[PDB]
């Protein structure tokens, strides 16, 4: 309840600040402006590379999602199995990175 009140208060303060920033300078009457970029009028071409680094983030973030219960997993009584699977998951994250390296995947966003 305290956390929800804190989130509500921070959202309310942010909304009030954006409200002041979009209402206070509008009350100046200065002048209307007539006839209100490097590219002229062209379509943004889709780049393969930005999408590749986005999907690479998504897959390694899933591997991070698997790695996140390790500070709780180190408390177990099957420590040989736990250490084996922890080293196996970090090794599979590293093998994903090595395959992303060696097949020209990290190129011009290296």
């Amino acid at each position: 309840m305290n956390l929800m009140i804190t989130l509500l208060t921070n959202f309310t303060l942010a909304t009030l600040l954006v409200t002041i920033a979009f209402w206070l300078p509008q009350l100046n009457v200065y002048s209307e402006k007539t006839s209100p970029d490097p590219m002229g009028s062209a379509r943004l071409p889709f780049s393969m590379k930005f999408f590749l680094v986005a999907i690479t983030f998504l897959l390694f973030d899933l591997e991070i999602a698997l790695l996140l219960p390790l500070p709780w997993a180190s408390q177990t009584t099957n420590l040989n199995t736990m250490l084996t699977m922890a080293l196996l998951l970090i090794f599979l994250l590293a093998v994903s990175l090595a395959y992303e390296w060696t097949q020209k995947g990290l190129e011009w966003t290296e």
Partner: protein, 297 residues
């Protein structure tokens, strides 16, 4: 004629035009393009300003060096008016408000200020005086604007008998309050007929009334080439601008039809071809963009 006021040159920026103009209310919509068109001839323009000097900055590129002289004035003080008109050979009056304020109502703006300017310019030896009234000015009118403006017209005609009085109907331009009022209102349609006049035509008419000696003591009516009904005019403004603060006096003046005055001369007698709305309304309303032309009468 004095030697310093003989026209020399080719009529460009650094030439001499022989016009020494005092434009009262030059910091508005008509004074902008009037000081522009006077300064491109090489005229000595005197701009009395009520506002902050920052709001006169756009009037400074409009002429050559020393050609626009800015000076302070109060609309209730005859002394500053005399200080501003005592060297001019033509005095143009463009002082107006669409609304009344706490310090100035329609009677303070349309009656007392033009009578004061015209009377002090009469006692200062000014040859040419130009007063700007509205086409729909009438004593028994529904709006206080047009009533006090007709009374001010009568007072200017009786205190400066050689004054040129000019009647534009509803002026449209980039900084207007006619097409931009319609484009942002998001009032209705009635049986109101309007013929709007274009601001460069009004400015060319004011200057050709400065230059013509036969325009002394005349009353002109500056109207556009096409009369439109109010509803399809407003719909054509919404069609060009790609769309689906006020007072009651502005509503009374939008729903007041523009009267036909055939006995008064117009822009065709001052050598000005009237520019239609269909050529310049795109130039006005391209700002409001995120077309079938309007039917006349």
């Amino acid at each position: 004629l004095h030697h310093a006021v003989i026209p020399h040159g080719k009529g460009g920026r650094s030439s001499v035009s022989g016009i020494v103009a005092t434009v009262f209310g030059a910091t508005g919509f008509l004074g902008r393009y009037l000081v522009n068109h006077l300064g491109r001839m090489g005229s000595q323009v005197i701009v009395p300003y009520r506002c902050e000097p920052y709001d006169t900055m756009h009037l400074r590129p409009m002429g050559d060096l020393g050609q626009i002289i800015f000076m302070d004035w109060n609309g209730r003080d005859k002394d500053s008016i005399r200080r501003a008109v005592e060297h001019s050979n033509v005095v143009i009056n463009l002082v107006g408000r669409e609304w009344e304020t706490k310090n100035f109502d329609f009677e303070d703006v349309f009656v007392k200020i033009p009578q004061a300017i015209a009377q002090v310019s009469k006692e200062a030896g000014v040859e040419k005086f130009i007063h700007i009234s509205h086409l729909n000015a009438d004593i028994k009118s529904s709006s206080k604007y047009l009533r006090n403006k007709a009374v001010g017209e009568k007072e200017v005609r009786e205190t400066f008998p050689e004054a040129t009085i000019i009647k534009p109907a509803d002026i449209f331009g980039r900084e207007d309050r006619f097409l931009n009022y319609f484009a942002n209102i998001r009032s209705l349609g009635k049986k109101t007929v309007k013929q709007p006049v274009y601001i460069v035509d009004v400015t060319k008419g004011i200057i050709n009334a400065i230059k013509d000696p036969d325009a002394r003591g005349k009353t002109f009516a500056f109207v556009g080439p096409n009369r439109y009904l109010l509803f399809d005019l407003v719909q054509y403004v919404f069609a060009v601008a790609h769309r689906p603060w006020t007072t009651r006096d502005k509503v009374e003046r939008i729903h007041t039809t523009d009267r036909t005055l055939p006995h008064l001369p117009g822009l065709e007698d001052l050598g000005v071809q009237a520019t239609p709305l269909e050529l310049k309304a795109i130039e006005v309303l391209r700002r409001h963009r995120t077309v079938q032309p309007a039917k006349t009468v």
